[PDB]
């Protein structure tokens, strides 16, 4: 009956994890054990992907989401994203999975054996939710840990082999970064970009220099904020603005995570730099641009002058102007002219697509890529019939980009619900009317009528 | 005590599952509606009536199995097992669609049974029969859609087949041939169903969020005794909330639950009426004024004209296989299609 | 006190006929701007080139529409996802042609309705209520974000957003069926369960409570006068409603705890509509409904059609006619 039932803890079984709010030691076990589960999944899944992986098929034809994350970091891959050594995948797999068991061990110990509460066993680890200095110190420690993590990525890019660079010539290759971008006009210019079409806020980051440099700033920002918070206490204004409770902090983080999942969703959908299409398949925009390219190529070979071909509407069948005048591909893909990709940028001139380059300079590798991408557009059914909704069964494909974007939208939505739930409850519980209205002091009864 | 009175006694006994006189109709017809559905989606084909597979046995899954309508060539036959078509031959009955009428008509009498059961139990417990009255809207829907609609058409072929995807096909048939989305009776039915869903959600959430603190735990469910006198939530704080949030609010609890009955019940009834019209092809298909203008002015376009073009694609692309008994042969060159697709 | 405190006190005052509040400070202007633009565009705006192909669709009453056909038309596919404020146009005339009202209306509307939701929380805090009505509203709110914002994002264009009209909505639904087989998507099947069940449970609850109203009136007055606003005691006999409904089905398929019964009413539709808003939101990224086209074949290999194949013939009809002039290439990849 150490809490652990409804009579003593006030929560029913279906909200039993709320019994842990003031049991710091059992609560510590739940988190470590749960971290165990996360690192387990990273490990089991990667090995699962390795066992099912055929290096001759594209990654995106084989249902892989984690190995492409490893390949983007520059392991196991060569020019054009060819897989040249699977051994590093194995290693990531086994090390996470082994590690899950130590995590596993530590969480189950703390949740069962160890002190239910920590605050008398050692004054450093034990905490009170309402201790504003202790909370900001934990925040600060985790800040520093995050800041280190960001600098680990920098270290891989600059000192430990580099990153896959889809924009590197010859069709992409791993490449060490030596001139990260530090100019904060650039690094923070991304934050002030519009999230709308043709700007894309931070999703638009299109080169590895900006990526590495952003992670220098963020690492140092997190390490400096960690110290700040370890040494400081919240100022008067901030104390008066927030609710200071276990559940409120939880709601602030659910808020954060929601915001981040939605951003992730748009990252994997639109960005082909840190989600290379070699690995994740083409973006929706990319596949649609690629179709127009493919049919431009076919018809030009037959004799069509593609710059002067008027389509049915009066717009060019292959090429038209965007609303600011740029030469772009025609047809419905006119919405996608913001697309930029390595297969396509060689045809680009100062005024957009260049007709002389189109008439003379299309290489067979661009034709291949454009045909490959047009036929791996991220459309497919839930049971993995690839193509439009009216396609016949045959092709067993759904793009990793669809899988990663749908899963994380779903996840980010429910975590915003969680935020509203727990934020609301935290406010009510702090005011002391979360169990209902006090009959003997019903607030509206002491208020004047509206009319 | 006469024998009728003794049989009453036993039928109206308080048991785990009340029976009643209404049971004599309800339980047998319901079981057989259910049974023939399960039986027929598990084992029976639609090959001879539709040119379709329709059972687990043939490789269909839960979404694509159906007990499909009889062939158009049966007209509106009752398709009795002992009737002129199947002549007592069970296998032939299954093959000619007899399970559809079996389900259709046993289901109908089962719904009757259920409403009578609602009436019978109300009377013995002594409550008003508003629930039985509320059940009239599901009955109007069932009768309109499954019986009246095909009786106005050429045959039972065009009634709904009893299947998840069969019903989706019916939905789309109704768009492409009846332009049923444009029909004001359907539109009222949509209002009643989405509005009922709304009332359901907003009423439940208001009660849950105006509760009084009648216990001391964080699980608020345990602070309710079904025999208490007092309202378990505050009508007064509910009213003020919604008055200031939305401008008006319920102030009368009886009217509020009467409205919850009225809205979805009246909406299903309105939709029933539109389907009775469609039994006759008496559709709201067109707006004549738009057509006279569009015919004369090739630059006039609206969402109304865009949707008919879609209707037109549905009819021509789906009819040959959806109505195989017509032997529709549409050469490629007659199929309506936009550019490229 | 000082000026800022008087203002804060009026803003958050529980004595205003309509609660304003901090969320209300953003909601009021944004809803007013959306509504005024909408009313004026619906009546008077000239044709809009939704599909960016110089083929304007007339949506307004003065250009030959009625209530059922009229709409505020989505902005041009040529614009895609670019921001198109009035001040980015060279003239109002260009803005009207290219569908700018639509952008102005949906953005102000999404913002104001986001704050309508926060206002619901906020007033409940000032009244000492529990806070989760706004959670319930999140289901319809999420739904609106899906058709007006998420689905444009996945598809690259607000021109594929749901039109602001009665027939425009139907257009949106038909096209969506052809490109996504939403009927075969479980999340939409969950939405239909949500709203059919919502309406079922609505009618049930109203019918069952109304059945057990306590004789408090004569047969010549409305039974509704048996209830007096604020009254301490309940006006129906839940024990009687359970006794009826438990016998209708069986005793434990019936609720006897009023709080559990009302929580069920809240949760059933809210959850279902969450799923259907997630349905639109994930089909935005082309994870479409189940595809069982030519799924059954015979020993030789002939296709044995199912109802799924029949649905696919309808789908193909919608596909090949929609936006009949906008495709130059064979696959409709967005």
């Amino acid at each position: 009956a150490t809490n652990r039932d409804q009579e003593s803890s006030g929560f029913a079984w279906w909200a039993g994890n709320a019994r842990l709010i003031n049991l710091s030691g059992k609560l510590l076990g739940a988190h470590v054990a749960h971290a165990g589960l996360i690192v387990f999944w990273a490990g089991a899944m990667t090995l699962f992907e390795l066992a099912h992986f055929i290096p001759e098929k594209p990654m995106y034809e084989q249902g892989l989401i984690l190995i492409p994350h490893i390949a983007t970091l520059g392991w196991g891959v060569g020019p054009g994203g060819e897989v040249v050594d699977t051994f590093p995948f194995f290693v990531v797999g086994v090390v996470h999975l082994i590690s899950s068991a130590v995590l596993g061990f530590g969480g189950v110990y703390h949740a069962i054996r160890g002190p239910e509460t920590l605050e008398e066993y050692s004054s450093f680890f034990g905490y009170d939710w309402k201790d504003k200095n202790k909370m900001t110190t934990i925040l600060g420690f985790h800040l520093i840990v995050l800041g280190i993590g960001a600098l680990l990525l920098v270290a891989k890019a600059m000192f430990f082999g580099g990153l896959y660079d889809t924009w590197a010539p010859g069709g992409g290759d791993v490449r060490v970064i030596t001139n990260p971008t530090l100019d904060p006009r650039v690094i923070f210019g991304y934050l002030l970009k519009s999230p709308f079409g043709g700007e894309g806020w931070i999703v638009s980051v299109n080169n590895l220099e900006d990526v590495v440099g952003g992670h220098i700033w963020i690492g140092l920002i997190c390490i400096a904020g960690g110290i700040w918070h370890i040494l400081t206490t919240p100022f008067g204004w901030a104390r008066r603005a927030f609710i200071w409770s276990g559940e409120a902090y939880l709601s602030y983080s659910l808020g954060a995570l929601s915001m981040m999942g939605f951003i992730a969703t748009c990252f994997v959908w639109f960005n082909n730099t840190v989600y290379p299409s070699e690995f994740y398949g083409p973006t929706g925009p990319e596949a649609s641009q690629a179709q127009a390219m493919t049919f431009l190529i076919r018809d030009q070979k037959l004799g069509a002058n593609v710059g002067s071909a008027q389509g049915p509407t009066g717009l060019g069948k292959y090429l038209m102007r965007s609303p600011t005048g740029e030469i772009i591909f025609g047809g419905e893909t006119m919405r996608f002219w913001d697309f930029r990709g390595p297969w396509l940028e060689p045809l680009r001139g100062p005024n957009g697509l260049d007709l002389n380059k189109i008439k003379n300079d299309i290489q067979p590798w661009q034709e291949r890529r454009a045909a490959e991408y047009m036929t791996h557009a991220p459309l497919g059914s839930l049971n993995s019939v690839g193509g439009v909704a009216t396609e016949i069964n045959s092709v067993n494909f759904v793009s990793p980009r669809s899988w990663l974007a749908t899963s994380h939208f779903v996840l980010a939505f429910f975590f915003l619900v969680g935020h509203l739930w727990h934020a609301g409850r935290a406010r009510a519980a702090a005011a002391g009317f979360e169990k209902g209205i006090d009959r003997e002091s019903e607030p509206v009864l002491s208020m004047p009528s509206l009319d | 005590r006469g024998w009728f009175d003794i049989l009453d006694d036993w039928l109206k006994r308080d048991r785990f599952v009340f029976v009643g006189w209404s049971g004599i109709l309800l339980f047998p017809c319901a079981y057989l509606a259910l049974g023939g559905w399960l039986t027929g989606t598990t084992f029976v084909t639609s090959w001879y009536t539709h040119g379709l597979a329709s059972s687990y046995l043939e490789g269909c899954n839960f979404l694509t199995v159906a007990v499909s309508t009889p062939a158009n060539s049966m007209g509106h036959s009752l398709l009795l097992l002992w009737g002129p078509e199947a002549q007592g031959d069970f296998t032939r009955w299954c093959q000619l669609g007899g399970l559809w009428t079996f389900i259709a008509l046993h289901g109908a009498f089962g719904l009757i049974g259920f409403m009578l059961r609602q009436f019978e139990i109300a009377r013995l417990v002594g409550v008003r029969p508003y629930n039985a009255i509320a059940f009239s809207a599901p009955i109007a829907v069932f009768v309109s859609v499954f019986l009246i609609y095909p009786l106005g058409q050429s045959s039972w072929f065009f009634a709904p087949s009893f299947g998840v995807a069969a019903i989706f096909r019916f939905l789309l048939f109704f768009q492409g041939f009846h332009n049923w989305t444009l029909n004001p009776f359907h539109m009222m039915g949509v209002a009643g169903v989405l509005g009922g869903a709304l009332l359901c959600a907003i009423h439940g959430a208001t009660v849950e969020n105006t509760l009084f603190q009648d216990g001391e735990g964080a699980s608020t469910f345990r602070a309710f005794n079904p025999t208490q006198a007092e309202e378990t939530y505050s009508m007064v704080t509910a009213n003020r909330f919604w008055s200031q949030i939305f401008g008006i609010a319920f102030s009368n609890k009886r009217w509020l639950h009467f409205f919850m009955l009225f809205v979805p019940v009246t909406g299903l009834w309105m939709s029933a009426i539109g389907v009775v019209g469609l039994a006759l092809n008496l559709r709201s298909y067109d707006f004549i004024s738009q057509e006279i203008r569009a015919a004369e002015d090739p630059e006039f376009e609206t969402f109304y004209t865009k949707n008919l073009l879609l209707n037109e694609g549905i009819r021509a692309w789906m009819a040959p296989q959806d109505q195989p008994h017509e032997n529709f042969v549409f050469p490629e060159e007659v199929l309506p299609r936009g550019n490229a697709l | 006190a000082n000026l800022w405190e008087r203002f804060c006190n009026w803003v958050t005052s529980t004595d205003n006929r309509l609660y304003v509040g901090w969320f209300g400070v953003i909601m009021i202007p944004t809803l007013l701007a959306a509504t005024i633009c909408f009313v004026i565009a619906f009546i008077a705006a000239p044709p809009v080139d939704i599909d960016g192909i110089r083929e304007p669709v007339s949506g307004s009453l003065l250009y030959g529409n009625n209530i059922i056909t009229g709409a505020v038309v989505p902005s041009s596919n040529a614009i895609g996802l670019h921001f198109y404020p009035i001040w980015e146009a060279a003239s109002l005339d260009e803005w009207l042609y290219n569908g700018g009202p639509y952008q102005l209306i949906i953005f102000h509307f999404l913002l104001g309705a986001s704050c309508y939701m926060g206002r619901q929380w906020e007033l409940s805090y000032r009244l000492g209520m529990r806070p989760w009505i706004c959670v319930a509203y999140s289901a319809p709110l999420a739904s609106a974000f899906a058709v007006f914002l998420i689905y444009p994002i996945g598809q690259g264009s607000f021109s594929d957003g749901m039109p602001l009209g009665i027939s425009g909505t139907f257009n949106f639904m038909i096209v969506f069926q052809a490109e996504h087989n939403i009927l075969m998507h479980p999340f939409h099947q969950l939405g239909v369960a949500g709203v059919f069940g919502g309406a079922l449970f609505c009618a049930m609850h109203g019918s069952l409570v109304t059945s057990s109203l306590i004789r408090e009136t004569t047969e010549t007055e409305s039974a509704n006068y048996g209830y007096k606003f604020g009254q301490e005691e309940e006006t129906y006999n839940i024990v009687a409603a359970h006794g009826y409904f438990g016998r209708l089905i069986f005793q434990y398929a019936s609720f006897n705890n009023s709080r559990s019964l009302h929580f069920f009413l809240a949760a059933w539709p809210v959850v279902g509509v969450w799923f259907t808003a997630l349905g639109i939101s994930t089909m935005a990224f082309n994870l479409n409904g189940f595809n069982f086209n030519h799924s059954v074949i015979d020993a030789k290999g002939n296709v044995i059609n199912t109802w799924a194949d029949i649905i696919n013939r309808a789908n193909l009809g919608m596909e090949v006619m929609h936006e009949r002039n906008a495709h130059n290439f064979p696959l409709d990849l967005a």
Partner: peptide, 30 residues
Amino acid sequence: METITYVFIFACIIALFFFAIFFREPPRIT
């Protein structure tokens, strides 16, 4: 005439809204 008619009905409803909020029967606590 048809535009005027649709606009007039819409405008009557907005006026109904105003009276139904601000000139409602005030709910009172008998």
